[PDB]
Amino acid sequence: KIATTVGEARLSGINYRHPDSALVSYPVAAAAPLGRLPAGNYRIAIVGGGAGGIAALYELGRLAATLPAGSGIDVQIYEADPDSFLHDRAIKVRGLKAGRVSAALVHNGDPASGDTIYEVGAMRFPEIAGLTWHYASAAFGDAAPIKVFPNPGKVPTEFVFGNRVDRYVGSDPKDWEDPDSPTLKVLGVVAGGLVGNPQGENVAMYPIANVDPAKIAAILNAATPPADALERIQTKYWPEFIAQYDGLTLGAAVREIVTVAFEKGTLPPVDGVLDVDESISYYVELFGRFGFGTGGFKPLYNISLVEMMRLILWDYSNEYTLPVTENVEFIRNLFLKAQNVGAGKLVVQVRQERVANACHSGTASARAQLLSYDSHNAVHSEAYDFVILAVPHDQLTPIVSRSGFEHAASQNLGDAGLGLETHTYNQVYPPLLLSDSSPAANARIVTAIGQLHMARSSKVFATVKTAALDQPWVPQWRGEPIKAVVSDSGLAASYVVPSPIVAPEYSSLLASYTWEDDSTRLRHDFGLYPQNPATETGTADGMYRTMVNRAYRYVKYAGASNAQPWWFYQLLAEARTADRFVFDWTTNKTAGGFKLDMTGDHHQSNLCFRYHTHALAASLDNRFFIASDSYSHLGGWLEGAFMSALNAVAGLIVRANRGDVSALSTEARPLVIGLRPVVKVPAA
Amino acid sequence: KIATTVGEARLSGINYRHPDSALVSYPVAAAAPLGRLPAGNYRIAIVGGGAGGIAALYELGRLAATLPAGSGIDVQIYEADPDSFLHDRAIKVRGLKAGRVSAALVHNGDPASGDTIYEVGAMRFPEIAGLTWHYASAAFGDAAPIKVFPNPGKVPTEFVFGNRVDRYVGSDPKDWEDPDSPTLKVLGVVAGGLVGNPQGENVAMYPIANVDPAKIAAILNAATPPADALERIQTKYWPEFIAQYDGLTLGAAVREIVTVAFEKGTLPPVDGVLDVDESISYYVELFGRFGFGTGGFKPLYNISLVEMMRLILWDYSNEYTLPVTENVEFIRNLFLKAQNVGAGKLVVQVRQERVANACHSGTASARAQLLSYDSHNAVHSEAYDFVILAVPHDQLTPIVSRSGFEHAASQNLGDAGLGLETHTYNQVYPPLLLSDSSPAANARIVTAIGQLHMARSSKVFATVKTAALDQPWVPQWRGEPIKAVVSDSGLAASYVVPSPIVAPEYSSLLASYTWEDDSTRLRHDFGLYPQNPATETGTADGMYRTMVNRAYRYVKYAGASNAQPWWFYQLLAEARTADRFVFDWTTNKTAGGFKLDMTGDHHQSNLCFRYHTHALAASLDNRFFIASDSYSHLGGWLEGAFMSALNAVAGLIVRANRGDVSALSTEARPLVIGLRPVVKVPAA
Ligand SMILES: Cc1cc2nc3c(=O)[nH]c(=O)nc-3n(C[C@H](O)[C@H](O)[C@H](O)COP(=O)(O)OP(=O)(O)OC[C@H]3O[C@@H](n4cnc5c(N)ncnc54)[C@H](O)[C@@H]3O)c2cc1C
Ligand SMILES: Cc1cc2nc3c(=O)[nH]c(=O)nc-3n(C[C@H](O)[C@H](O)[C@H](O)COP(=O)(O)OP(=O)(O)OC[C@H]3O[C@@H](n4cnc5c(N)ncnc54)[C@H](O)[C@@H]3O)c2cc1C
C-alpha cells in the first residue's frame, strides 16, 4: 500500500481526473504524443524554464518526432533567472533552480562533497499526482526508488497551540500520548464533515452529487467509471458545488462544522469557564493550527472551500520524495529527455533574457512577437509562429497587460519607465487575444490573470547534525525522536529532514515553513530579500536568532511540574552557525509562492484554465498559450504546472491545425473539448 | 453639508454608536473624566506612544487632576521607535512619528523650510469619527479649520479597469464624462445592495433587524433613539447579523448582489460577446477596482461582510484633513495636553526601550512586571501597579505569549534567542490574566491576539511641482486637473496632494497606495525595507522607476482612433529624481498596516475588544489592559485606537476600585457594562 518506486506511484494515480477536468485523465492523455501538426518548420518560443515550460518542451519534442523529413520545431526558451539550471550546462544556488523547484547546496568549499540540501521550493509530491509521476518516469524510470515524505504524523510529531501540546504518530489514538486529546477529537469532526465516508451513510456537510466527497474521489480515480458519471460531474455536480460554496471560505466551513458538533455534544466545552462561542472558536483555531497532514491550514483559511475540496478529493497529504539529491534534477532530466525524444526534429536554444512584452503584430507569417532584454539590458525582438508563456501570473502581467485590448496602429513597447530601449510594433493586437472585436473579452483574460492570488511563503533553514536528535533533551515517541513540530510560536511548521547526500551526518533543519499571514509576521526579521545570505559565504545568523527567540517559550507538559523553556529552542540553537538561511518567495519576482484561490477566484482561475480553448475559433488568429500552475486548479503543485503545459500544447496543436480538433489524439481531445470554451463556435 | 472646522466635524459624529458597542457614544463617555480613583500614589506604565498610548495618557491626566492633595500618578511610557516624537523633545523622519501616524518631511537641507510632507500612515479622517474629532478638539480647539480630503470622486478622478476608463466627480451622472458608464451603474447596484435606503422600501440584500443598513445607521447616529432599540441592536440584531454573515466575504457578497441584478436585467450583458458568468465576473471585478469612495476594495474582498458593514454604517468615506502640517502634531499636542490637564498630579517619563516581556509576579504591592531592552540592548525590569499595553497585535504577541498560561514557580524571561540577558521572575502568572484556574481562558486571549489579521500596506511617494498638473496632457474636468487616479495598473490608487507647507509650489505625489495583494505584488521592487531610502539623503530612484514602468501602458479613450502611452506615466515621470520614497508597513515591526478582520475573525477581535471587562472580576486582580486599533472594531482608524484606549482606562478605573463600576461616571459606565463580560466566572 506504500509506493516504493516511481512506477508504483505513477500507476497509483494514472486514472485520477480532477473535478474541473473530470472527463480526462491527464496521464492517459499524455501516454502518446498529444496530436499531429501539418508539415512545416515551426518557430516556437517558450517563456520560462520551470516545470511548465519544460513539460511543454517535452510534449513539443514528442510532437516533433512525428514530423516528416524536412520538417521540424525550433524552440527559443527564454529564462531570466541567472541561477537556472539552463545557464549551467557555504550555500550554493547557482544552477540549482528550475523556477520554484529550487535547491540550496550546503557545503564546505567543495560543492561536490556537500553536507545537505535545502529544498527551498517544491519538496513533497502526492501519490496520486499522476502527471507528476508520469514525467518522473520519463526523467528517472519506473524502477527509481521513492520515500515517504516525513510530514507531521508520518514521523513522531509535536503539536503546540495555546496551552495544548500533543505528541503523536498517525491518526490511531493508541499512538497519541493523550488518546483523549481534544485535537484528535476536532480532527475527526472536521474530517467527517469535509471528507465523509467512502462507503455507507453519507455524513459530510458539503456533499457533491448528494453524496460524501470520499465517494466522488473513488469515481474520479476509477479506471473505467460508470457511463455518463464523469460527464455529469463535469457539467452538473461540480459546477453546482462551485455555485453553492465558492463564496464560503475554508475557515467559515470549519466553523460551521465545529458549531454543529458542539451543539450535538461531540465537542465538549473546553473547560468549565469558556462560554459557547469561546469553546467553538477554540476548536476552530486548534484545528486551524493542526491541519490536514501538512501542518496548520489556519493561514490558508481564506481559500475557497472549493480549493480545499480539490485537495480532499486528491488525497493530497499522502506524499513522497523524488529519486534525487536535488529536486531540480527532475526538471533538468526532463529538459534533456525532451531533446532526446525529439529525435533530431526538435532544436532548442536558451536565451538568458527577460521577456518584457508580448503582442501580435505585422503581416508576416510569424506574427507572435516577444520583446526581451539581455543581461546587459540590451533590447531584442523576435517573431514566432506560436508562443507558450510559461510564467506565473504576476510575472505574466507586465508582458500581456500593457498593450491595451484592441488593434493599435503602432506601439512603442518595452520597459520605458526603467529607461530601457523600446521597439515599435505596427498593426498591433494584444497577445491574449480572445476577440477581434470585444475589448471586454480581451480585458477579462488580462484582468483575471492580474488578480489571481499568489500565496505568500517563506522557508527558514539551518544545518544540524542528525545526532542532535539523539540527545536526551529531544523527546522520543514510539521509538524515534520527534522530527516534525507544528506550532503557534510563529514558526508554523518545522522539520528535521535527513540529508539526501549519503544515516547521514547532517540534516536540513527546516526551522520554519510559513504561508500567508504566518509568513507576513516573520518578514520584518529576514534582513535581506529575497535571500539571506545574498552571498554564497555568508550566514543569516541574525535572522535565525530571531527564529530561535520565537521558540524561547515556557511550555508546560503533562510530564513535568516545572515548566522550562521549550525543548525545541535547544534544538534550533543546536544548528551550526554557518549556513543559516531564509528565502522569501514573496520578495522574489514571483511575488509569492503559488496560486491559492480566494472566494470568487474560480471565475478568474478557471478562465485561465480554459484559455487554450481559443484554438477552436479558427477565424481568431491567436498564437499565444499559457503554461503555469497559476493557470490551473492545482496552484502550488507541479501537477498544476504540468496540467497547464498539457493544455497549452493541446491548444497549440489545434491552432496549428486551424481549428481542427481531430488533430488531437483520441485520448487528448478532451483536454480541449471537455471544457467550456472561451470562444463560442458551432457544435462539433 | 461640508464641515469647515474641527468643532463642526466633532458635533457631526458626537452621537454615533458602533454596532458592537451600541449602548454607548464614545464621545459622550469621553466628555468628562472617565471616573474616580481611590487616594494613592500610582505607578503606571504605558507601552507604546502611538494614538492608543497617548490617548490613554491623556485620560490618565484627566483622572490625575481629580485626585486629592498628596495623591498622584506616575507614568513610565515605553517607546522603542527611535523616530518617535517622544524622543525629540532630503527626507527627514526623525521625530515625525507617533507609531502609524508617520510623516516624512521633504527638504533641501533646512528642515524648517521644506517642500512637502508625505503622510506615510494615517491621512484621512471620517467626518463621523466622533472620538477622533473629540481628541482633535482637545489638541487644536473647535475653531481650527479642516479641509475635505481629495479622495477619488471628491476631486476630478480618472478610473481605469481593463478596457474601461472613466473620468468623474461624485456619483451624479451629470458629473461623469460618460453618464451612461457601466461603472456608475454597477456602483448603484452594489451600494443599493449593501447599504439600501434610509426611507421607503428595503432594497438591501443583507438586512439588519429586517431593514436596510441605512435605516440602522440612522438609529445608531440618532441623539435620542429608543434605548430599547439600541439594546436590541447590541444584544439581538447585530449578533444575528454576525451569526449569519461572519462567514461571508465581501467579494462573495458583491458577487451575490451582482448576480441577482444581472438576472433581473438591472445590469446588462457586458457587450454581448461575454456570456452570463463572464459578464457577472466583469462587473464584480470592475466594482472591485472602483470602490466605495477611497479606491478599489478588490484587495479587501476577503474581509468579512461584517467588517465592511461596520464601515457602511459609519459612512467612512466622507473624510477630512487635520489643522496641521504633519499629522504627528495631533499626537504630540495630545501628549502635551495630557501633561497640562494633569495639573501637577501627573508625572511622565519616557523610556527609549523595547518591552520584551510582561507578567505578573512576586508578592509585593506592584506586581505588573515589564522586561525591556534599551537602545544598546541593556536589560531593565520594573514593576507597576497597572500597565496599558498600547501596541498592535504582532508587537504584543512576543510580550504576552512566551510565559505559558498558568502559575509558574520561576521563569527566566527575555530575549534569550537574541543572546540578550534574561531576568528571573518568581511566582509568575501571565500578563493577560483571565483566570486563576483556566489555562484555556489565558490561552484563548493570547492565541486570539496572535492570529488577528494585519492588513498589508505600502505607500510610494515622490515630490512634484504642482504646476505639472497644468501640462497639456493632464486631463481636466470643468477646467480642474485630474488629481486622483484609481487603476488596475498595479499602482491601485494615486493622489497628487498639495503640500501643506504653505497655492504651494510642490505636491506630494502619492504614486501608489496599496493594500493586501496589491502591496504584495509590488514588494519585490522596493529594494530596501521597510523604507527606501533608508537614509535622509538617498532617493528610491530605481524603485520608483518600476512604478513609472507599470504606468507605461497603452490606454484607449473613447472616440480616439488609437491608444497612446497613458498620460499618467508622463505625470509620474515629472516627479523630481531626489526624494523618491517607499514605506512598506509590512516589513516594519508592525508586520503590516492595520487590522482587518477575515471571515471568522469577529470572535477573535471581539474578545480583544471586550478584554478590559476583566476588571469586573474583583479577585482576579489582573493589572494589564490593552489599547490599540488591533483591539477594536475599527482597525485602520485612529477611531479604533482611541476607542480601545478609552476601554483600557475605563477598565483600569474599575480594577483600581476592586471591581466597583460605580467608580465610572454615569456616561462611561456602559464602556464596561454594555459589553458581554470576558470572565463568566466569577460574575460581576
Ligand atoms: C514554497 C513553495 C513550496 C512548494 N511546494 C510544492 C511541493 O512540495 N510539491 C509540489 O508538487 N509543488 C510545490 N510547489 C509548487 C511548484 O514549485 C510549482 O507548481 C512549479 O514549480 C511552478 O512551475 P511553473 O512553470 O508554473 O512556474 P515557475 O517555477 O515560476 O517557473 C517560471 C520560470 O519562468 C522564468 N521567468 C519568469 N518571468 C520571466 C520573464 N519575464 N522572462 C523570462 N523568464 C522568466 C522564471 O525565472 C522561472 O524559471 C511549491 C512552490 C513553492 C514556491
Ligand atoms: C498605511 C496606513 C494608513 C492609515 N490610514 C488611516 C487614515 O487615513 N485615517 C485613520 O484614522 N487611521 C489610519 N490609519 C490607522 C492609524 O494609523 C492607527 O489606527 C493608529 O495610528 C494606531 O495607533 P496604535 O496606538 O494602535 O498603534 P501604533 O501606531 O502602532 O503605536 C504603537 C506604538 O508602540 C511602539 N511599540 C511597539 N512595540 C513596542 C515595544 N515592544 N516596546 C516599546 N514600544 C513599542 C511603537 O513604536 C509605536 O510608536 C492608517 C495606518 C496605516 C499604517
GROMACS .gro file of N, CA and C and ligand atoms in nm, chain A residues 47-54 78-81 84 97-101 120-126 132 314 319 351 353-356 390-392 395-396 399 454 457-459 513 515 585 590 592-594 627-630 634-641, ligand 1:
model
  239
   47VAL      N    1   0.846   3.099  -2.295
   47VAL     CA    2   0.894   3.200  -2.197
   47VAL      C    3   0.886   3.132  -2.060
   48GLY      N    4   1.000   3.098  -2.006
   48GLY     CA    5   1.011   3.037  -1.875
   48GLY      C    6   1.054   2.893  -1.883
   49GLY      N    7   1.161   2.860  -1.808
   49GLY     CA    8   1.217   2.729  -1.799
   49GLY      C    9   1.193   2.659  -1.665
   50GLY      N   10   1.072   2.674  -1.613
   50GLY     CA   11   1.029   2.599  -1.500
   50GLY      C   12   0.956   2.473  -1.539
   51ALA      N   13   0.886   2.412  -1.445
   51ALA     CA   14   0.815   2.291  -1.471
   51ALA      C   15   0.717   2.303  -1.592
   52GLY      N   16   0.643   2.410  -1.596
   52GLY     CA   17   0.550   2.430  -1.706
   52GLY      C   18   0.618   2.438  -1.840
   53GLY      N   19   0.720   2.522  -1.850
   53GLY     CA   20   0.787   2.537  -1.978
   53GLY      C   21   0.860   2.414  -2.022
   54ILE      N   22   0.922   2.342  -1.930
   54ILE     CA   23   0.994   2.222  -1.966
   54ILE      C   24   0.903   2.108  -1.998
   78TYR      N   25   1.323   3.122  -2.325
   78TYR     CA   26   1.367   3.241  -2.253
   78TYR      C   27   1.368   3.210  -2.104
   79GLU      N   28   1.481   3.239  -2.037
   79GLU     CA   29   1.493   3.215  -1.894
   79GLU      C   30   1.580   3.323  -1.832
   80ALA      N   31   1.513   3.412  -1.755
   80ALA     CA   32   1.575   3.529  -1.697
   80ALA      C   33   1.652   3.496  -1.569
   81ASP      N   34   1.627   3.386  -1.501
   81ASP     CA   35   1.687   3.358  -1.373
   81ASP      C   36   1.835   3.318  -1.391
   84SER      N   37   1.923   2.960  -1.299
   84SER     CA   38   1.863   2.847  -1.364
   84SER      C   39   1.961   2.744  -1.406
   97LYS      N   40   1.831   2.590  -0.967
   97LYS     CA   41   1.694   2.633  -0.976
   97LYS      C   42   1.633   2.593  -1.110
   98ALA      N   43   1.505   2.552  -1.104
   98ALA     CA   44   1.415   2.542  -1.220
   98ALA      C   45   1.289   2.612  -1.175
   99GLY      N   46   1.295   2.746  -1.174
   99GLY     CA   47   1.186   2.826  -1.121
   99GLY      C   48   1.169   2.808  -0.972
  100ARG      N   49   1.047   2.761  -0.937
  100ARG     CA   50   1.008   2.733  -0.799
  100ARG      C   51   1.043   2.594  -0.752
  101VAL      N   52   1.111   2.513  -0.837
  101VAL     CA   53   1.184   2.399  -0.793
  101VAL      C   54   1.328   2.446  -0.767
  120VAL      N   55   1.406   2.463  -0.123
  120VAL     CA   56   1.354   2.597  -0.097
  120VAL      C   57   1.218   2.617  -0.153
  121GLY      N   58   1.187   2.546  -0.263
  121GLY     CA   59   1.054   2.543  -0.325
  121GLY      C   60   0.991   2.406  -0.311
  122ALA      N   61   0.947   2.344  -0.416
  122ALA     CA   62   0.878   2.218  -0.411
  122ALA      C   63   0.962   2.112  -0.336
  123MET      N   64   0.888   2.032  -0.253
  123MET     CA   65   0.955   1.929  -0.178
  123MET      C   66   0.878   1.798  -0.155
  124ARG      N   67   0.747   1.794  -0.176
  124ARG     CA   68   0.671   1.674  -0.138
  124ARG      C   69   0.561   1.652  -0.238
  125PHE      N   70   0.544   1.525  -0.282
  125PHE     CA   71   0.467   1.504  -0.404
  125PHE      C   72   0.361   1.401  -0.375
  126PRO      N   73   0.233   1.438  -0.395
  126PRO     CA   74   0.122   1.346  -0.364
  126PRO      C   75   0.135   1.215  -0.443
  132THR      N   76   0.265   1.425  -1.257
  132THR     CA   77   0.396   1.442  -1.192
  132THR      C   78   0.476   1.314  -1.206
  314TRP      N   79  -0.822   1.468  -0.397
  314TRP     CA   80  -0.692   1.419  -0.447
  314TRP      C   81  -0.611   1.344  -0.338
  319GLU      N   82   0.223   1.186   0.066
  319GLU     CA   83   0.327   1.237  -0.024
  319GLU      C   84   0.461   1.165  -0.015
  351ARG      N   85   1.789   3.136  -2.421
  351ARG     CA   86   1.816   3.277  -2.417
  351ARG      C   87   1.814   3.322  -2.269
  353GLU      N   88   1.745   3.595  -2.113
  353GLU     CA   89   1.679   3.720  -2.139
  353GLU      C   90   1.550   3.725  -2.066
  354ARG      N   91   1.511   3.840  -2.019
  354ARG     CA   92   1.383   3.866  -1.958
  354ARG      C   93   1.287   3.922  -2.061
  355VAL      N   94   1.175   3.850  -2.085
  355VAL     CA   95   1.070   3.899  -2.171
  355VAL      C   96   0.996   4.010  -2.101
  356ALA      N   97   0.982   4.125  -2.167
  356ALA     CA   98   0.912   4.240  -2.116
  356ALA      C   99   0.774   4.258  -2.176
  390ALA      N  100   0.507   3.056  -2.012
  390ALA     CA  101   0.520   2.957  -1.905
  390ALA      C  102   0.576   3.024  -1.778
  391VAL      N  103   0.509   3.133  -1.734
  391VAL     CA  104   0.545   3.206  -1.616
  391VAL      C  105   0.421   3.229  -1.535
  392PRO      N  106   0.432   3.239  -1.400
  392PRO     CA  107   0.315   3.259  -1.315
  392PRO      C  108   0.263   3.400  -1.325
  395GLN      N  109   0.432   3.753  -1.288
  395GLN     CA  110   0.535   3.771  -1.389
  395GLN      C  111   0.478   3.784  -1.529
  396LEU      N  112   0.360   3.729  -1.554
  396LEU     CA  113   0.295   3.741  -1.684
  396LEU      C  114   0.231   3.874  -1.706
  399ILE      N  115   0.387   4.152  -1.921
  399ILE     CA  116   0.409   4.103  -2.055
  399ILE      C  117   0.283   4.113  -2.140
  454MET      N  118  -0.151   3.513  -0.537
  454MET     CA  119  -0.027   3.441  -0.511
  454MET      C  120  -0.009   3.428  -0.360
  457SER      N  121   0.488   3.295   0.099
  457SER     CA  122   0.554   3.185   0.165
  457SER      C  123   0.700   3.208   0.184
  458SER      N  124   0.753   3.153   0.293
  458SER     CA  125   0.892   3.166   0.324
  458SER      C  126   0.948   3.038   0.390
  459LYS      N  127   1.075   3.008   0.370
  459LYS     CA  128   1.138   2.896   0.437
  459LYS      C  129   1.267   2.943   0.502
  513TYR      N  130   0.852   2.685   0.793
  513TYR     CA  131   0.790   2.692   0.662
  513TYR      C  132   0.655   2.756   0.684
  515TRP      N  133   0.314   3.011   0.548
  515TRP     CA  134   0.224   3.061   0.445
  515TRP      C  135   0.151   3.185   0.492
  585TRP      N  136   0.972   3.381  -0.080
  585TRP     CA  137   0.915   3.381  -0.215
  585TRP      C  138   0.838   3.507  -0.245
  590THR      N  139   0.847   3.632  -0.838
  590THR     CA  140   0.717   3.566  -0.841
  590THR      C  141   0.609   3.636  -0.760
  592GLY      N  142   0.542   3.583  -0.449
  592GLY     CA  143   0.489   3.481  -0.365
  592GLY      C  144   0.522   3.340  -0.412
  593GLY      N  145   0.467   3.242  -0.342
  593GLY     CA  146   0.499   3.104  -0.369
  593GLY      C  147   0.414   3.036  -0.473
  594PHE      N  148   0.282   3.053  -0.474
  594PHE     CA  149   0.197   2.979  -0.565
  594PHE      C  150   0.056   3.026  -0.550
  627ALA      N  151   0.111   2.852  -1.962
  627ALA     CA  152   0.150   2.725  -1.903
  627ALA      C  153   0.217   2.748  -1.766
  628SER      N  154   0.139   2.739  -1.660
  628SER     CA  155   0.192   2.754  -1.524
  628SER      C  156   0.089   2.701  -1.428
  629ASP      N  157   0.134   2.669  -1.306
  629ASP     CA  158   0.039   2.636  -1.201
  629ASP      C  159  -0.060   2.748  -1.172
  630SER      N  160  -0.025   2.873  -1.205
  630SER     CA  161  -0.117   2.985  -1.190
  630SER      C  162  -0.241   2.970  -1.279
  634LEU      N  163  -0.463   2.348  -0.950
  634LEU     CA  164  -0.367   2.292  -0.857
  634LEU      C  165  -0.249   2.388  -0.844
  635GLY      N  166  -0.280   2.515  -0.813
  635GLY     CA  167  -0.174   2.604  -0.776
  635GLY      C  168  -0.100   2.550  -0.658
  636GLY      N  169   0.032   2.560  -0.658
  636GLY     CA  170   0.112   2.504  -0.551
  636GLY      C  171   0.157   2.364  -0.573
  637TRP      N  172   0.138   2.309  -0.695
  637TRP     CA  173   0.180   2.176  -0.723
  637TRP      C  174   0.242   2.167  -0.862
  638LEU      N  175   0.348   2.086  -0.873
  638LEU     CA  176   0.399   2.053  -1.004
  638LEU      C  177   0.287   2.000  -1.092
  639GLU      N  178   0.193   1.925  -1.034
  639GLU     CA  179   0.084   1.872  -1.113
  639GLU      C  180   0.008   1.985  -1.182
  640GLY      N  181  -0.012   2.100  -1.119
  640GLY     CA  182  -0.079   2.208  -1.185
  640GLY      C  183  -0.001   2.268  -1.299
  641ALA      N  184   0.128   2.287  -1.279
  641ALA     CA  185   0.216   2.337  -1.387
  641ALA      C  186   0.212   2.241  -1.505
 1369LIG     C1  187   0.746   2.746  -0.115
 1369LIG     C2  188   0.694   2.652  -0.227
 1369LIG     C3  189   0.653   2.525  -0.195
 1369LIG     C4  190   0.607   2.435  -0.287
 1369LIG     N1  191   0.581   2.303  -0.251
 1369LIG     C5  192   0.549   2.211  -0.352
 1369LIG     C6  193   0.554   2.076  -0.323
 1369LIG     O1  194   0.600   2.025  -0.215
 1369LIG     N2  195   0.512   1.987  -0.422
 1369LIG     C7  196   0.475   2.034  -0.548
 1369LIG     O2  197   0.435   1.949  -0.632
 1369LIG     N3  198   0.485   2.167  -0.575
 1369LIG     C8  199   0.520   2.252  -0.480
 1369LIG     N4  200   0.535   2.383  -0.515
 1369LIG     C9  201   0.486   2.428  -0.644
 1369LIG    C10  202   0.579   2.406  -0.759
 1369LIG     O3  203   0.709   2.456  -0.718
 1369LIG    C11  204   0.527   2.492  -0.877
 1369LIG     O4  205   0.394   2.447  -0.910
 1369LIG    C12  206   0.609   2.479  -1.008
 1369LIG     O5  207   0.746   2.469  -0.981
 1369LIG    C13  208   0.573   2.602  -1.088
 1369LIG     O6  209   0.623   2.589  -1.226
 1369LIG     P1  210   0.581   2.697  -1.331
 1369LIG     O7  211   0.645   2.660  -1.458
 1369LIG     O8  212   0.437   2.724  -1.322
 1369LIG     O9  213   0.647   2.836  -1.275
 1369LIG     P2  214   0.794   2.876  -1.219
 1369LIG    O10  215   0.853   2.763  -1.144
 1369LIG    O11  216   0.773   3.004  -1.151
 1369LIG    O12  217   0.883   2.896  -1.349
 1369LIG    C14  218   0.873   3.010  -1.431
 1369LIG    C15  219   1.008   3.033  -1.491
 1369LIG    O13  220   0.995   3.147  -1.581
 1369LIG    C16  221   1.108   3.237  -1.559
 1369LIG     N5  222   1.065   3.370  -1.591
 1369LIG    C17  223   0.968   3.441  -1.523
 1369LIG     N6  224   0.940   3.558  -1.581
 1369LIG    C18  225   1.025   3.564  -1.690
 1369LIG    C19  226   1.039   3.658  -1.789
 1369LIG     N7  227   0.970   3.771  -1.795
 1369LIG     N8  228   1.128   3.628  -1.889
 1369LIG    C20  229   1.199   3.514  -1.883
 1369LIG     N9  230   1.193   3.419  -1.789
 1369LIG    C21  231   1.101   3.448  -1.698
 1369LIG    C22  232   1.145   3.214  -1.415
 1369LIG    O14  233   1.278   3.255  -1.389
 1369LIG    C23  234   1.119   3.065  -1.394
 1369LIG    O15  235   1.236   2.985  -1.410
 1369LIG    C24  236   0.592   2.474  -0.422
 1369LIG    C25  237   0.639   2.600  -0.458
 1369LIG    C26  238   0.689   2.689  -0.361
 1369LIG    C27  239   0.749   2.820  -0.407
   0.00000   0.00000   0.00000
